[PDB]
């Protein structure tokens, strides 16, 4: 559903 | 709920600046950043005309309450102000800056350029700023300052044809419309129009009604169509979309029973409201033609849109990607959690659907019963439509046949019409009789036999 | 070697007629073989609702069956009462009653035309 | 690749099977309740006068088909058939019957002629005359050949469900392209052509009649191949 | 562009029998009525006869199939809610189907079908745009559904098999 | 009893104080079915129902013998605002209306429309 | 099922001017 | 008579209908299932909620049907 | 493809050339890449129209795609400089022009597509 | 929990996609095609004319495996494109939301 999560 | 034009004026740039943040939330895109430049562009020229309204109020009077202005403006109903090379009417001149605001955040024709592109905002914000919050703060003008408006002659002309014309625009760009956002944004926009057609009118009860139908259940289809549209993967276009029934169960029916009762259809909660704005559209404007027209087009525009929404979303054939259907119909996720999408979800757009009903409901038992029961509405302005719905003659009778039959006929069209090739052509074509002399014989004994 | 009428090969056909080609064998199915449980309830509930809701629209508000179709044959309503007397007395009794009904519809009318002035 | 029977509360297809309502699956078992359980357990429908009156009573199996050959009465002692339309012929046919009834009952029943005449009008002159009524005009009920005239015989639905046959000449029968006319006709082809056959078109020159051959027709063999017609 | 072209075919003289229902094994409805079984299937199938009728459904059950090589034609047996009735069907325009396209091809809900009607052998005749349903009670002669003539080989076309019907 | 649709059951006219209490819609107010209005929405207040009540309730229960006075006056408000006793009439018999003229104001225009040619 | 690696910053690639931005298009 | 005529233009279609490519129809196939698609009346079932609209309709006679004025028109 | 057709000012003719090739200036693409690109072109552009349309009719989307391919197989056997040629380019610009549709669908796997940057990569830096 | 301590990017490996998965589907849509005769002769490093893909026909396929695996490819790197090898390694490597 929702993007990919990605180190911030 | 603004006791003061100050406060009026804060609500008005608050939901402005706040309407713009919501259309920017996708910062990082620049092509966003136009949508939402284009909106805070319109709303500022809002904000101008409301300025500029305020200060002329304040200027004659010197208060800038809003009950005191409302029990004062006949008073100075009569007079002038001297402009550049003009004596305008002061009533016109206050009620032309108001009604410029009010058509500028209701999107009406001309000015409505920026609500298509306010669709870029995420769905919960779009339905928000849709169904009751962004495009009804002018309509809220209007019944606030009415008494203004009683009194003024660009209202009266001013008011319904630019109604029935946005209304006429708005329903059939949504008719023919392909995306989802897109024709829940026309459709807005004809009822709009229509409310803004009823408040030319004159029945506050009427205006009141049509807004909370149109509120709700906008808000509704708003919902099922941001479930459509993050089941599809951010493809609002429904030429991508085919056979979503079985993926989207709850939304079907909810989708189903939000858009009859949105678009004016009989037995249907919505019918009232579009049969109520018909009993009281006025006869005495000089483009009435156009202007019954135009409604009559743009009432007869929302089954179109309607069951194209509907049909091509969910039981059309399947023309997305083989991805969204493969990736869901795989038979490890078989299980009593499956679904496609929340059940809060699911849960709240029940209850959102239950309450409508028992709260419009309650608005038809206080207004529409032979009871009046309603609270004051501190106008003193009584337009006689009530007659023709207490004791409608046979004249409007007959004449409400003409539009009912109108649908009929657009619904026969829209059902049994065939545009491709299918092993069922022959068959339905003989549904299609057999339905016409079922019908017939069926009013026969209905109405003679018994 | 196989010919058709065979049950194996039929039903390798019924399940392949609208298989997935690119996808490996075991897994080139392309139906969903459920429906959502909990989604498929509440939408079925709402549906009813709605259904009811309707329903109850074309009986308890019949205006427009009436204002699109014609006020349609009534089914019989009537009460029994006037069968209690026989006879001649029944016989005058039933003719006052019409007599009485005939100059109520006319006194309603004429009441009707005749009190535009009472509003003063 | 399931996994339901890992977990003791997990959903099971006696849980689903109320959805065979609104999903297609094969039989498992009948209830109380069906058709066939009611009809195969009550012992009155066993009564040999309900066996009779479903017997007598109902669509007969001399009307249905018994072969993938036919060969439909001659229309002329002389000729032979070549093309017989089968079900959009009859639907073509039923749907024209109704001038007969719904019109005239229409009029001695509706309260207002003059305002469904009005609706009519419209109604028939968008949606509904290409939609149906070109179709049936043009279409091609029966088609035979007349060898002596060396003439053909084609069969027409007219108003009110009439059939009538007329005669062309061979030599008089030319093909007209589907492009010559999807443009003149679109909305013809586009709402009501789907029965009929688009690349098999063919129009009379000296009468400049159209002749539409349906798609689910039976065509002959023998007749295609017949010199007359080749 | 597909077109139903006749050939004006003819049985042969010995056929081979290729299905023959346990049920309804004698011959007459006046015998069916009589065997207690065959009343009973009956029974069950008058839905189906139904569902013929007013749903305009055209579906066949089939019973006692004969096939001619020589000529290449099948003799199918098919009780209606009249009686037994004989048709005759080309290998040319016999093609099989699934179950739920059979059942979809009616846009109206049928009845919920007995259990004694064979979901997977299923067949469809083109030319009729008929449906032939066997029942599961059945023998089949393996020699001669064993035939050269019958074996897909031969009588496989995929444009007519996969192509042919498409419900949506 | 024999009074005016307008009047009610104890021939009563409220005043402008008793209004103001009684406080009534402007849209009521209006009209001169004031006076048989009051006793109806004093009985509402006095026994309050509910909405689904009131809309299946087509006698409204207990405050009967005052709604029967108010529709009365409504009944003729609305038809005198309308003019509908007259339209209707005209409908009926276009023909005899002119033969005998009910209202020569509304018969010199009135033309029914051509689909309504019963 | 596959580990699929971080996001990639190709997801925003960065732009290159190639033309003058002319002082009439500010 | 060397006249082009329906068997003519019947095997031309035919020639033209044999010239398509089956590589669409090959990848296309998945669409059309009949396991994964039906029509809105077949998912729309009024059956049992027309039960309980008869139930609330015969509660609705039999609690407020009684107190209805005849409406004759 | 970038797919920034309504976005920086193209002209009509620009976009017609985006859509049909790849290119703005396809005189510089060579006839196999004029032809196959062109070929793409109006394949995507009738599977859009005839596929993923409105009540799409697959038999004639069928029929429609045999003949965009006969064609074009004609015109990749003609030769470069002949007006055949042209006249077939000018016949499938013309088409593309024709079946061009507004707020036609883009794919989000594109650059300059609705949701195409809603998120910013932080580098390791 | 992300840890409090700095983590970089993990460019586990340059695949989005299973590789062989993807090879594996564009080999069985290229066999679909008419003009594919020997499904067996394909492999990761035989070219489209070897393997019988005509220039025409390319198009068709590569349209057809961006309708499978859901993603775009453009003009320019469709005509890179010289080997199986090379189209599968780019769809593995792409980025379905770019
Ligand atoms: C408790 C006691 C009871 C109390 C009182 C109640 C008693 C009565 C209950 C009756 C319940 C409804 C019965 C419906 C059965 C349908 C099946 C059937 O009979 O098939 C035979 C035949 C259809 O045969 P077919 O072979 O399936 O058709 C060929 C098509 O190619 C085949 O289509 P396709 O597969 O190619 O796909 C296209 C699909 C297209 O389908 C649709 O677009 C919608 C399908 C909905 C299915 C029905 C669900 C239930 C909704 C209706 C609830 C009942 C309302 C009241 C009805 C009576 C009013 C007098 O077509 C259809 O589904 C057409 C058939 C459905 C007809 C019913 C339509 C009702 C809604 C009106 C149209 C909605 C348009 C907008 C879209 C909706 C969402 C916004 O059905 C018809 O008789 C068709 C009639 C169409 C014209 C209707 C015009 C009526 C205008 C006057 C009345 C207006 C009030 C109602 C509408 C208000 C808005 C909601
Ligand atoms: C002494 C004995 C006397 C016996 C008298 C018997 C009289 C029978 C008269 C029958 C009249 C015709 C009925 C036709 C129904 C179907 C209509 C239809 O589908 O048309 C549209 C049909 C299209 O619809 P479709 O959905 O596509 O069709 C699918 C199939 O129809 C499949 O459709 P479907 O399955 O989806 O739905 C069809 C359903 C339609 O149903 C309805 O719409 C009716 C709904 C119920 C209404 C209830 C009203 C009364 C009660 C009110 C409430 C009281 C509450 C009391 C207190 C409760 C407190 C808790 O049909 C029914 O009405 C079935 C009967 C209802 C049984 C349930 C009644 C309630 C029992 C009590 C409660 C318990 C319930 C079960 C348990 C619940 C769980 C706990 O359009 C057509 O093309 C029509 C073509 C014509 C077909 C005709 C087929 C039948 C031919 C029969 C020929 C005559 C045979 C005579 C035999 C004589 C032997 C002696
Ligand atoms: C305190 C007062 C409370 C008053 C409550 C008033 C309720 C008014 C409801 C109005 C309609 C709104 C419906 C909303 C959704 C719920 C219904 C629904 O899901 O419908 C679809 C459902 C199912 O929809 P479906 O068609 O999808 O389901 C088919 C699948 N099966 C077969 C499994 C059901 O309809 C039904 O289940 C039919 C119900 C018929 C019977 C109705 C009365 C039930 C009474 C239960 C209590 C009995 C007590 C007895 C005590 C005896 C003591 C000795
Ligand atoms: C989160 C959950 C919250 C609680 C959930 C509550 C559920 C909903 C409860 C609703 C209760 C009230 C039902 C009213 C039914 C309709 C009454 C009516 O027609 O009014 C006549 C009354 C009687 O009026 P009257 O006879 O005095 O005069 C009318 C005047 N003329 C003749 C000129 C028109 O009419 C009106 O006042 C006008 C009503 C217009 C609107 C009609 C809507 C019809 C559809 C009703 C849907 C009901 C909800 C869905 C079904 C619920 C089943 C339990
Ligand atoms: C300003 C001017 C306005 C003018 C408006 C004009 C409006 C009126 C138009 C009149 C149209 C008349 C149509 C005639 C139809 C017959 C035509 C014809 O010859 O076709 C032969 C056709 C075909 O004949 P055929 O010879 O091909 O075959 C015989 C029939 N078959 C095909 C079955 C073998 O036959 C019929 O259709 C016979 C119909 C007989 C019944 C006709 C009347 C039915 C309606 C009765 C009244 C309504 C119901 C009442 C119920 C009462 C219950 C108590
Ligand atoms: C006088 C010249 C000849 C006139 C021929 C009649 C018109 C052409 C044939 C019409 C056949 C269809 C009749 C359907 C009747 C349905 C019941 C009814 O309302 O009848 C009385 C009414 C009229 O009876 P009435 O005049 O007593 O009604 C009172 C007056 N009104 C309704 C205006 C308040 O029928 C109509 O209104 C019919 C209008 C004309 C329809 C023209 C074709 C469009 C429809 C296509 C066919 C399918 C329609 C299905 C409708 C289903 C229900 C919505
Ligand atoms: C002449 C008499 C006086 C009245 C004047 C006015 C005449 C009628 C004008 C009707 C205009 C309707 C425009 C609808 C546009 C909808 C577009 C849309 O969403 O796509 C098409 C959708 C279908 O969308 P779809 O998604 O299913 O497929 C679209 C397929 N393509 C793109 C190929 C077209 O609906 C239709 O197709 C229905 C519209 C066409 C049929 C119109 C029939 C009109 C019948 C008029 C009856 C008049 C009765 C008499 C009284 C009238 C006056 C009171
Ligand atoms: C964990 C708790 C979560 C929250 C739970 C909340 C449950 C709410 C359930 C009902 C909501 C829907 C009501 C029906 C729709 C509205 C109808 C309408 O307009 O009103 C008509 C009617 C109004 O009355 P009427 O319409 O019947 O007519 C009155 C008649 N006269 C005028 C004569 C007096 O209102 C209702 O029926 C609504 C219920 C009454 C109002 C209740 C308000 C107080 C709530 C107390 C509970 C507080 C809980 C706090 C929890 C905090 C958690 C953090
Ligand atoms: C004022 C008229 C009011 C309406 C009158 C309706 C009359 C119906 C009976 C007509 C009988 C004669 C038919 C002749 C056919 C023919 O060959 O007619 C052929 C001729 C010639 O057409 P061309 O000039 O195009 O060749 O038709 C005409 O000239 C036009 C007349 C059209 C008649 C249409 C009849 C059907 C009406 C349908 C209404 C909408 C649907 C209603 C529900 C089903």
Redesign the interface.
Same mark, same amino acid.
């Given at each position: 559903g929702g993007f990919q999560k990605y180190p911030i | 709920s603004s006791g003061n034009f100050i406060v009026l004026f804060l609500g008005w740039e608050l939901i402005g600046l706040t309407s713009f943040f919501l259309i920017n939330f996708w910062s990082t895109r620049v092509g966003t950043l136009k949508a939402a430049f284009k909106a805070f562009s319109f709303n500022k020229l809002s904000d101008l005309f409301l300025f500029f309204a305020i200060l002329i109020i304040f200027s004659t009077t010197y208060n800038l309450d809003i009950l005191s202005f409302n029990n004062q403006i006949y008073l100075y109903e009569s007079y002038n102000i001297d402009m550049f090379y003009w004596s305008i009417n002061l009533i016109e001149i206050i009620s032309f800056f108001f009604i410029s605001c009010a058509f500028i955040k209701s999107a009406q024709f001309g000015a409505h350029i920026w609500l298509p592109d306010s669709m870029e905002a995420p769905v919960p914000a779009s339905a928000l700023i849709h169904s009751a919050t962004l495009v009804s703060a002018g309509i809220y003008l209007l019944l606030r300052l009415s008494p203004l408006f009683e009194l003024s002659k660009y209202a009266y002309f001013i008011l319904p044809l630019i109604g029935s014309v946005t209304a006429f625009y708005g329903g059939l760009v949504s008719a023919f419309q392909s995306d989802t956002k897109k024709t829940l944004a026309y459709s807005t926009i004809s009822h709009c129009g229509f409310l803004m057609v009823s408040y030319s009118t004159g029945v506050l009860e009427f205006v009141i009604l049509y807004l909370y139908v149109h509120g709700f259940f906008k808000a509704a289809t708003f919902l099922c169509v941001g479930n459509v549209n993050r089941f599809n993967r951010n493809i609002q276009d429904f030429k991508r979309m085919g056979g979503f029934y079985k993926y989207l169960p709850f939304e079907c029916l909810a989708s189903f029973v939000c858009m009859i009762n949105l678009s004016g259809l009989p037995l249907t909660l919505g019918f009232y409201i579009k049969h109520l704005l018909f009993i009281g559209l006025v006869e005495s404007y000089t483009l009435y033609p156009l202007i019954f027209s135009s409604l009559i087009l743009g009432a007869i525009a929302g089954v179109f849109y309607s069951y194209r929404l509907f049909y091509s979303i969910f039981f059309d054939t399947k023309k997305g990607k083989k991805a969204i259907y493969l990736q869901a119909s795989r038979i490890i996720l078989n299980s009593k959690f499956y679904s496609n999408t929340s059940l809060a979800s699911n849960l709240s757009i029940t209850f959102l659907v239950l309450i409508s009903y028992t709260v419009i409901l309650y608005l038809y038992c206080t207004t529409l019963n032979n009871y009046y029961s309603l609270s004051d509405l501190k106008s003193i302005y009584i337009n006689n439509a009530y007659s023709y719905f207490y004791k409608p003659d046979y004249n409007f009778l007959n004449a409400v046949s003409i539009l009912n039959w109108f649908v009929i006929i657009l619904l026969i069209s829209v059902i049994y019409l065939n545009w491709r090739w299918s092993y069922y052509y022959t068959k339905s074509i003989d549904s299609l009789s057999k339905f016409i002399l079922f019908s017939f014989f069926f009013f026969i004994f209905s109405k003679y036999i018994l | 070697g196989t010919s058709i009428f065979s049950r194996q090969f039929k039903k390798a056909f019924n399940d392949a007629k609208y298989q997935n080609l690119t996808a490996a064998q075991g897994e080139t199915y392309s139906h969903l073989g459920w429906i959502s449980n909990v989604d498929l309830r509440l939408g079925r509930a709402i549906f009813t609702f709605g259904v009811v809701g309707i329903a109850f629209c074309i009986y308890l508000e019949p205006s427009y069956f009436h204002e699109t179709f014609g006020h349609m044959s009534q089914p019989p309503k009537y009460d029994l009462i006037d069968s209690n007397i026989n006879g001649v007395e029944k016989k005058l009794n039933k003719q006052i009653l019409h007599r009485e009904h005939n100059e109520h519809k006319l006194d309603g009318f004429v009441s009707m035309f005749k009190g535009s002035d009472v509003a003063k | 690749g399931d996994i339901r029977h890992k977990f003791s509360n997990e959903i099971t297809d006696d849980d689903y099977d109320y959805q065979r309502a609104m999903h297609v699956k094969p039989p498992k078992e009948e209830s109380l309740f069906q058709l066939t359980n009611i009809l195969s357990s009550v012992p009155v429908f066993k009564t040999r006068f309900f066996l009779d009156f479903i017997a007598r009573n109902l669509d007969t199996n001399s009307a249905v088909s018994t072969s993938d050959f036919v060969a439909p009465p001659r229309v002329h002692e002389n000729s032979f058939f070549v093309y017989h339309s089968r079900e959009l012929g009859n639907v073509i046919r039923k749907y024209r019957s109704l001038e007969s009834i719904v019109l005239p009952g229409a009029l001695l029943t509706f309260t207002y002629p003059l305002f469904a005449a009005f609706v009519a009008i419209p109604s028939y002159y968008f949606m509904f005359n290409a939609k149906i009524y070109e179709m049936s005009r043009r279409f091609v009920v029966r088609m035979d050949v007349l060898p002596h005239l060396e003439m053909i015989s084609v069969q027409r639905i007219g108003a009110f469900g009439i059939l009538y046959t007329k005669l062309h000449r061979i030599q008089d029968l030319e093909y007209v392209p589907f492009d010559q006319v999807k443009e003149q006709e679109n909305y013809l082809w586009a709402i009501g052509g789907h029965g009929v056959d688009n690349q098999l078109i063919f129009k009379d020159r000296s009468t400049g009649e159209f002749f539409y051959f349906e798609r689910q027709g039976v065509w002959d063999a023998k007749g295609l191949n017949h010199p007359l017609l080749n | 562009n597909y077109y139903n072209i006749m050939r004006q075919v003819s049985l042969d003289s010995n056929p081979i029998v290729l299905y023959q229902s346990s049920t309804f094994t004698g011959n007459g409805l006046q015998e069916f009525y009589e065997n207690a079984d065959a009343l009973t299937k009956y029974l069950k199938l008058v839905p189906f006869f139904l569902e013929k009728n007013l749903y305009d459904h055209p579906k066949q059950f089939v019973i006692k199939m004969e096939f001619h090589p020589q000529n290449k034609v099948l003799s199918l047996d098919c009780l209606t809610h009249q009686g037994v009735l004989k048709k005759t069907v080309n290998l040319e325009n016999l093609i099989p189907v699934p179950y739920e396209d059979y059942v979809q091809f009616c846009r109206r809900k049928l009845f919920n079908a007995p259990l004694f009607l064979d979901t997977e052998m299923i067949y469809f005749n083109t030319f009729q745009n008929e449906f032939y349903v066997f029942d599961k009670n059945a023998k089949w002669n393996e020699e001669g559904i064993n035939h050269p003539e019958l074996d897909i080989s031969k009588l496989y076309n995929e444009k007519a098999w996969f192509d042919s019907l498409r419900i949506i | 009893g024999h009074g005016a649709w307008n009047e009610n059951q104890q021939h009563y006219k409220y005043s402008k104080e008793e209004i103001e209490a009684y406080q009534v819609p402007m849209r009521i107010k209006a009209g001169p079915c004031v006076d048989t209005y009051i006793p109806l929405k004093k009985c509402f207040q006095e026994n309050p129902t509910s909405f689904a009540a009131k809309m299946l309730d087509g006698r409204k229960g207990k405050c009967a013998k005052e709604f029967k006075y108010y529709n009365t006056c409504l009944n003729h408000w609305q038809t005198y605002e309308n003019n509908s006793h007259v339209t209707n009439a005209y409908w009926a018999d276009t023909s005899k209306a002119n033969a005998d003229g009910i209202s020569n104001t509304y018969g010199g225009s009135f033309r029914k429309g051509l689909a309504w040619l019963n | 099922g596959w580990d699929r690696p971080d996001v990639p910053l190709s997801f925003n690639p960065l732009y290159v001017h190639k033309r003058e931005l002319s002082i009439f298009d500010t | 008579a060397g006249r082009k005529l329906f068997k003519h233009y019947i095997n031309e279609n035919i020639k033209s209908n044999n010239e398509q490519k089956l590589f669409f129809y090959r990848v296309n196939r998945w669409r059309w299932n009949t396991k994964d698609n039906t029509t809105a009346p077949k998912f729309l079932r009024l059956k049992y909620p027309l039960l309980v609209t008869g139930v609330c309709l015969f509660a609705y006679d039999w609690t407020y049907g009684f107190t209805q004025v005849d409406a004759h028109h | 493809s970038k797919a920034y057709y309504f976005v920086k000012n193209f002209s009509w003719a620009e976009v017609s050339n985006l859509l049909c090739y790849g290119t703005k200036y396809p005189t510089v693409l060579n006839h196999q890449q004029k032809v196959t690109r062109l070929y793409r072109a109006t394949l995507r552009r009738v599977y859009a129209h005839q596929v993923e349309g409105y009540k799409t009719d697959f038999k004639q989307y069928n029929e429609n795609i045999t003949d965009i391919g006969k064609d074009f197989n004609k015109m990749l056997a003609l030769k470069p400089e002949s007006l055949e040629l042209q006249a077939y380019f000018k016949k499938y610009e013309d088409l593309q022009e024709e079946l061009f549709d507004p707020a036609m669908i883009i794919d989000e796997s594109r650059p300059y597509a609705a949701s195409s940057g809603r998120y910013y990569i932080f580098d390791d830096y | 929990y992300?840890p409090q301590k700095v983590?970089? /990017?993990?460019?586990?490996?340059?695949?989005?996609?299973?590789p062989d998965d993807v090879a594996? /589907?564009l080999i069985?849509?290229i066999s679909?095609?008419?003009k594919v005769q020997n499904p067996s002769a394909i492999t990761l490093k035989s070219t489209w004319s070897e393997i019988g893909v005509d220039?025409?026909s390319?198009?068709?396929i590569?349209?057809?495996a961006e309708?499978? &695996?859901?993603?775009?490819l453009?003009?320019?790197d469709?005509?890179r494109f010289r080997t199986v090898e090379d189209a599968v390694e780019f769809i593995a490597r792409? &980025? &379905?939301?770019?």
């Open positions: - | - | - | - | - | - | - | - | - | 992300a983590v970089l /990017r993990n460019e586990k490996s340059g695949y989005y996609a299973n594996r /589907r069985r849509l679909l095609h008419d220039p025409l390319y198009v068709e590569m349209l057809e309708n499978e &695996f859901y993603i775009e453009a003009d320019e469709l005509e792409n &980025f &379905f939301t770019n």
